[PDB]
Write an enzyme that holds these catalytic residues in place. Sequence first.
Site, PDB file in Angstrom:
ATOM      1  N   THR A  44      -2.737   2.886  -3.403  1.00  0.00           N
ATOM      2  CA  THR A  44      -3.298   1.246  -3.632  1.00  0.00           C
ATOM      3  C   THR A  44      -4.795   1.130  -3.835  1.00  0.00           C
ATOM      4  O   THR A  44      -5.142   0.642  -4.950  1.00  0.00           O
ATOM      5  CB  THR A  44      -2.603   0.337  -2.552  1.00  0.00           C
ATOM      6  OG1 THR A  44      -1.263   0.740  -2.311  1.00  0.00           O
ATOM      7  CG2 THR A  44      -2.741  -0.859  -2.970  1.00  0.00           C
ATOM      8  N   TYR A 107       8.804  -4.913  -7.463  1.00  0.00           N
ATOM      9  CA  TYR A 107       9.151  -5.665  -8.443  1.00  0.00           C
ATOM     10  C   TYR A 107      10.698  -5.962  -8.452  1.00  0.00           C
ATOM     11  O   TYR A 107      11.303  -7.013  -8.537  1.00  0.00           O
ATOM     12  CB  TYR A 107       8.574  -5.589  -9.731  1.00  0.00           C
ATOM     13  CG  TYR A 107       8.757  -6.614 -10.853  1.00  0.00           C
ATOM     14  CD1 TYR A 107       7.942  -7.703 -10.814  1.00  0.00           C
ATOM     15  CD2 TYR A 107       9.797  -6.587 -11.485  1.00  0.00           C
ATOM     16  CE1 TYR A 107       8.269  -8.766 -11.885  1.00  0.00           C
ATOM     17  CE2 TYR A 107      10.467  -7.723 -12.518  1.00  0.00           C
ATOM     18  CZ  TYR A 107       9.468  -8.820 -12.202  1.00  0.00           C
ATOM     19  OH  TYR A 107       9.772  -9.749 -13.367  1.00  0.00           O
ATOM     20  N   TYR A 133       6.160   5.203   2.107  1.00  0.00           N
ATOM     21  CA  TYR A 133       5.164   3.902   2.011  1.00  0.00           C
ATOM     22  C   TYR A 133       5.603   2.601   1.987  1.00  0.00           C
ATOM     23  O   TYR A 133       6.384   2.297   0.992  1.00  0.00           O
ATOM     24  CB  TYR A 133       4.104   4.266   1.014  1.00  0.00           C
ATOM     25  CG  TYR A 133       2.788   3.274   0.822  1.00  0.00           C
ATOM     26  CD1 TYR A 133       2.485   2.346   1.883  1.00  0.00           C
ATOM     27  CD2 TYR A 133       2.090   3.354  -0.125  1.00  0.00           C
ATOM     28  CE1 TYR A 133       1.457   1.400   1.534  1.00  0.00           C
ATOM     29  CE2 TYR A 133       1.077   2.293  -0.329  1.00  0.00           C
ATOM     30  CZ  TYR A 133       0.656   1.522   0.616  1.00  0.00           C
ATOM     31  OH  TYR A 133      -0.263   0.778   0.304  1.00  0.00           O
ATOM     32  N   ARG A 138       3.153  -6.412  -1.003  1.00  0.00           N
ATOM     33  CA  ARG A 138       2.871  -6.014  -2.486  1.00  0.00           C
ATOM     34  C   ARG A 138       4.172  -5.926  -3.310  1.00  0.00           C
ATOM     35  O   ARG A 138       4.029  -5.926  -4.430  1.00  0.00           O
ATOM     36  CB  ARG A 138       2.155  -4.663  -2.436  1.00  0.00           C
ATOM     37  CG  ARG A 138       0.526  -4.781  -1.689  1.00  0.00           C
ATOM     38  CD  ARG A 138      -0.150  -3.376  -2.013  1.00  0.00           C
ATOM     39  NE  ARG A 138      -1.430  -3.828  -1.288  1.00  0.00           N
ATOM     40  CZ  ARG A 138      -2.526  -4.371  -1.869  1.00  0.00           C
ATOM     41  NH1 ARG A 138      -2.364  -4.693  -3.194  1.00  0.00           N
ATOM     42  NH2 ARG A 138      -3.562  -4.481  -1.311  1.00  0.00           N
ATOM     43  N   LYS A 161       4.052   5.833   5.845  1.00  0.00           N
ATOM     44  CA  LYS A 161       2.843   4.987   6.062  1.00  0.00           C
ATOM     45  C   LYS A 161       3.436   3.513   6.140  1.00  0.00           C
ATOM     46  O   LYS A 161       3.774   2.875   5.060  1.00  0.00           O
ATOM     47  CB  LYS A 161       1.853   5.083   4.590  1.00  0.00           C
ATOM     48  CG  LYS A 161       0.523   4.287   4.550  1.00  0.00           C
ATOM     49  CD  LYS A 161      -0.114   4.414   3.271  1.00  0.00           C
ATOM     50  CE  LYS A 161      -1.138   3.411   3.160  1.00  0.00           C
ATOM     51  NZ  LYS A 161      -1.885   3.408   1.862  1.00  0.00           N
ATOM     52  N   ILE A 203      -3.542   5.724   7.115  1.00  0.00           N
ATOM     53  CA  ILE A 203      -4.054   5.914   5.808  1.00  0.00           C
ATOM     54  C   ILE A 203      -4.942   4.703   5.739  1.00  0.00           C
ATOM     55  O   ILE A 203      -4.587   3.406   5.508  1.00  0.00           O
ATOM     56  CB  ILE A 203      -3.046   6.110   4.729  1.00  0.00           C
ATOM     57  CG1 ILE A 203      -2.449   7.177   5.465  1.00  0.00           C
ATOM     58  CG2 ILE A 203      -3.499   6.252   3.516  1.00  0.00           C
ATOM     59  CD1 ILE A 203      -1.106   7.921   4.368  1.00  0.00           C
TER      60      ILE A 203
END
Lengths: 292, 292, 292, 292
Positions: A44, A107, A133, A138, A161, A203
Site C-alpha cells: 500500500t 471493491y 493481508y 481500504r 498482515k 509491517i
Amino acid sequence: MFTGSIVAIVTPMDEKGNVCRASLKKLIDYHVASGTSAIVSVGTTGESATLNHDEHADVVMMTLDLADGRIPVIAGTGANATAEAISLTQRFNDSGIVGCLTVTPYYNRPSQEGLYQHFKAIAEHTDLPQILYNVPSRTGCDLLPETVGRLAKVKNIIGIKEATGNLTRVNQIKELVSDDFVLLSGDDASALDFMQLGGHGVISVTANVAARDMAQMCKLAAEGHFAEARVINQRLMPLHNKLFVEPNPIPVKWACKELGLVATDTLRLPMTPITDSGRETVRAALKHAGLL
Amino acid sequence: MFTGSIVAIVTPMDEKGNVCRASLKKLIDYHVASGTSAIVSVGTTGESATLNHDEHADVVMMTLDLADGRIPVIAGTGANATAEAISLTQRFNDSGIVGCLTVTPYYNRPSQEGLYQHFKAIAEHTDLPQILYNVPSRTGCDLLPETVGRLAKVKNIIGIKEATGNLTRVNQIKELVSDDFVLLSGDDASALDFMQLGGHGVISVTANVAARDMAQMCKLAAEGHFAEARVINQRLMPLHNKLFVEPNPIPVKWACKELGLVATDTLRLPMTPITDSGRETVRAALKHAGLL
Amino acid sequence: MFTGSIVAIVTPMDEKGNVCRASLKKLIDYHVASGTSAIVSVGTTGESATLNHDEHADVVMMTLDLADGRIPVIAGTGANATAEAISLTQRFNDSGIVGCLTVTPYYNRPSQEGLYQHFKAIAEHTDLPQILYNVPSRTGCDLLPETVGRLAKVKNIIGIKEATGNLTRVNQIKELVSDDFVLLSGDDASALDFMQLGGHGVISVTANVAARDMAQMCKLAAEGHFAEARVINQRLMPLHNKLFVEPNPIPVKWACKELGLVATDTLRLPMTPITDSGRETVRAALKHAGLL
Amino acid sequence: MFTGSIVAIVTPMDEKGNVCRASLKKLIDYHVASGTSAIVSVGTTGESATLNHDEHADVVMMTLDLADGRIPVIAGTGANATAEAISLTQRFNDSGIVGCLTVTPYYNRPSQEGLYQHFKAIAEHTDLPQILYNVPSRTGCDLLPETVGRLAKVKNIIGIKEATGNLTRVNQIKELVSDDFVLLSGDDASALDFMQLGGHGVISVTANVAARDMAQMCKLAAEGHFAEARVINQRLMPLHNKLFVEPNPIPVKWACKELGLVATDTLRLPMTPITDSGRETVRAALKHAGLL
Ligand SMILES: [Cl-]
Ligand SMILES: [Cl-]
Ligand SMILES: [Cl-]
Ligand SMILES: [Cl-]
Ligand SMILES: [Cl-]
Ligand SMILES: [Cl-]
Ligand SMILES: [K+]
Ligand SMILES: [K+]
Ligand SMILES: [K+]
Ligand SMILES: [K+]
Ligand SMILES: [K+]
Ligand SMILES: [K+]
Ligand SMILES: [K+]
Ligand SMILES: [K+]
C-alpha cells in the site's frame, strides 16, 4: 523469517512520477544499516495502486537487486481479480523474493468462500510463502479469523498482515493456526499492543523514517521487554498517527524527503502533495521522535 | 437521457468466464422492449473488477454494436490511478457511448482534494458526459457534497450515481449544483425515496430482471405519483434486498439464468457460484415481484 | 483490593420481581467458596436500571450483610444526574462497602468536561474509592483516556471498568495514570486479552455461573501464565458470548436457575423471559464449559 | 394536532438550577404568537435526565397552567423501567396534557419483544395518546419498523418521534401502520427531508428560537411546497447543526438567553456551561438564520 520490523517501503519517485533509483538505493542502504528485518516492495505504502504491473515488477526487481542479498524482500502481489493475482505472482517466481504480501480483493467484496478460493488459487500457482493481508477500510472486505484458519491449512500460506487495529484478532487467529503461522501488525499505532498479545512483528509505515527505533522496539517486544519497548513507542506515537494526517503515503514520503532519504516527495494522482498544515504536523511528530 | 431507470447490466459469461454475445443480445433486446432508459456497460454489476481493460472495452463495443442505436450506452470507466482512468476513457472516444460512469478511486483512499484532481483531469481529457460514482462501502472513500459541488462546475461533469443509501445526500448535493446536474441512485433499496427527495432516476441492479416495473416506477416518481410508484417498489423490495444476499452480481446473474435471459450464471473469481440457500431466497424474491 | 475476578452479581428475584434473599445468600456463599475476589452489587447485571434507589440500597445492604465480612462488596452508584449520583453514593457512606462502581451518565450525553465535573463532584462527597465505568453502547457516552487521566488525579478515583472491548484503551489509560490505578475489563469475551495487555482483573458477567474457572483464569493471568489462562478462556468463550444471546441479564439469570443457584429467573420489564431458542443456546454453552 | 412544528421546549432555570416560571412564561407566549403547533414538556431538550419525577411533574403542570388552553401540551413520560413509565404516566392522568412522548428504555438495551411489552403496558394504563420516541444514539436501543407496526395496532399508540436521522425509516414505518399514525422527525437537520418523504411534522429543538420559520416551513411541507420550505430550511441549517455543537440543551439554552427569551442559560450537571468557541458558533448560526 517474517518477524520483527518489516518496512512497507515507499516507492521514491522523480518529479515525473517514475521510480528514482538513487533514492531507492539510499532507502535500502538505510534499512540494511538500521536493522530492519525485511522489506515489503510495492505494498500500500509503495503505491501499488498507481503502478501498472510492469512498473510494479520493475520496482520489485530493482529493490531486490539493490538489497543485494543484504535484507530479504517481500513482493506485494494483491489484485482483486484472482487471475491477475496469479499472473503478478508468477512474475516473481524464481526471482529471489522470499515471499508475497497478498491483500483481500478490494471493491468487489467477495464472500468468505470467495476469499478462500482466491487465496487458495494464488498459493497453488507458486512455491513462494504467502502472507495474507486484511485491511477492511481500504478494501470493503473483512477476512475473518475462521477463514484465516482454513487458508492456514494450505502449505505455503504462512502468515497474515492484520491491519484492522482490532486487537482481539491476534488471539482469535492464533488459536486456529499452527504455532509457526506468523501474525504481523499492519497498523503502527496498535502494533506494540498487537505484539504484546502474541504478534510476531509489524509491517510498518513508521519504519520508513524511524527504522532504527522500530527495529529496537520490535526486538524488545520479542524478548518480552514490553515496558522498555513502550518508551520507544510513546516517542514514536505522534508519528504512528500523523503519518496518516493525510492519506498514506503522502505524509511519510514528505518525511523521507525532509530527512534527506529521498530526492523528491512526488506521488501519483489521485495522491496529492502534502498540505502546508500537513507538513507542520508531520514535522512536529518527527521532532517528538528525536529524528529532526 | 440520464434519467429514469438505467440498468447496470450484467456481463453474461459462458462456462469459461468469457463474454457470451448471444446472452448479451437477449439482455439488450429485453431492455429495448421493457423501456429501460439507458444501459450502463461494465459497471460494478458488470464485473468491471475482474475484466482487464481490453475485455472491458470489448464488452462496451459489443454492447454498442448489439444495441444498434436502439438504447443509449454508458461506459464504466472507473480506475484508482488517474492516468488509467484517462487512458480508459480515451479508449471510448468516438465510440458511440453517450457518457461515462467513473467511480471514486478505491483502495488508495485519496483526500477530497485528490478526488477533485482525479475527476477534473479525467473530464479535461474527454468531451463525453461524466457521471461521478460514489460507493464508499466498496472503495474506502466518500466523495462529499462540497466536492461534488466543486466538480459540478466542470463543463462535462454532469451527474452523480450516489450509492451510499444516505438520503440526506440528495439535497445536500442539489443545493450546491445547477438544476441540470442529475442525481441518480446507485442503491436500489432506497432509490424510490431518493427520487422522491429530488433524484432523477436510478442506476439499477434490480432493473436487470424487473426492467418494465423499474421503468414504470421511475416514470411515476418523475411525475410525482409516489404512492403509485411505492406500490411497485414494495413488490420489488425483497428483490432489492436479496439481489445482495450474496455479493453482487452473484444473485442477479443467477436470476437472469433462471428467467432464461442468459445461458449461464458463470462469474469470475473471486466471485463464486450462488449457494443453495441463496438460490431459494432469490427465487422467493422473484416470485414476490411476480416475475416467476 | 480491586483485582482478579469480580462478579457483577445478578439480583435474584422471586416471581413478583422482588429480591429473593435465599437465592442471594446462596450466590454469595458460592462466590465465597469459589474464590471470587469481590462482588459488585446492583451494577448493570444486577438490574440497577429497574430498581428504585430504595430497592437498590436494600439489595446492597442485604448483600453486604450476607457476605458477612467474607468477601468485599462494591456498590453500583451510577446515575445520569450528578445530584442523584451523589445522593445514592451517600447512602453507602460508612456502610461497609469497599468502593463504588459509577457509570458515565447515560442518555444525556455529556461532554468530556461534563464527565470530569460529574465524577469529581461525586468523589468529593465521599471517602469511598471510585471505579469509573465506561460502556458507550449502553450510555451513548464515551469516557476517553485523556479524561480518565484527569480524573485519576482525584484522590479517591482509583480505577476504571472499561467495557468498550477496545483493547487499545488499556495502554492509552495506563500511560496517563499512576501505577496503582486499576484497569478492569467490563467485557468478558476480551477480558483475558485485556489482562494480558496490563489489565488487573475483570468485572465479570460470566463469573456468575463459572466463578471458579474465572477466578483461576484471572490468577493465572496475573501470574503471567497466559497460555494456561487461555485454555480456561477457550472453554468459557461460548459462554462469554452466549450470555448476551439476549439482553443481559436475561441469559445469565436463566443459567443461574438452570445451575440451581437461584430459585427463579424472573427479571423486571423491559427485560423479558429468555426465549426457548435462547435457553438451548445458553445450555449448549454451559455444557461446553463443563458446568452442565 | 400532533402535526407541524412541535417544540421540545427548554426548562428555563435560575442560577440555582430551579425552574424559572417567568422565563417559562416568556417562552410559552412566544410559541402562542409564533404559531407553534404544540409544546413537548420535559423531553430530552427539557432536561428530563436531571429532573426528578416530582420536579418533572411540576414543570409539566406549570407549563399547562401558563399555556392556559392557548397551545396543546405533550408530557415527556419516558423511563427505562416499565413500572416507572406507568407511574409517571399515571401522574398526568386528568391533567390537561393532550398526549405523552415516551422514549425507548435507555441503558438496559431491551429486545424488540421487550420494547413491545414496555410500550404495550404503558398504553394499557392510560387513555392518553402515546407518541413513541426512538433515539438510539442516546439509549443504546433501536426500535425497528416491524415493532412500531405491532405497537401501532394498540388503540392509543398513535405516533412516533423518529430521531435516527435515517430517512429510510419514514416509509418502512408508513408501510406498516394505518394512515392516521403520525410520523414526526426528532432530528432537526433532516426533518424537512423526513416530511418530504411523508412525515407529518417535527418535534424540534430549533423551534425554541426559530418558532415562526419552523411553523411556516412545516406548513409549506405539509402542503407539498418543498422548494419554498427548503429555502427557509437552508437559512436554519447552520442552527440545526450548531444547536448540537455541544450537548443539547447547552447551545439552545444559551441562544434563548441571548435573545432575551430566558433570564439565565443555567443547566444541571452533568450539563456544563457553554464554551466561548461554542458561543461564537451559535451566534453565527443565529445571524445566518436572521434571528440576531
Ligand atoms: Cl482496516
Ligand atoms: Cl456505499
Ligand atoms: Cl437516510
Ligand atoms: Cl460499550
Ligand atoms: Cl482493539
Ligand atoms: Cl439517534
Ligand atoms: K495498479
Ligand atoms: K501453512
Ligand atoms: K479490472
Ligand atoms: K457541469
Ligand atoms: K433505576
Ligand atoms: K487517584
Ligand atoms: K430523571
Ligand atoms: K393506534
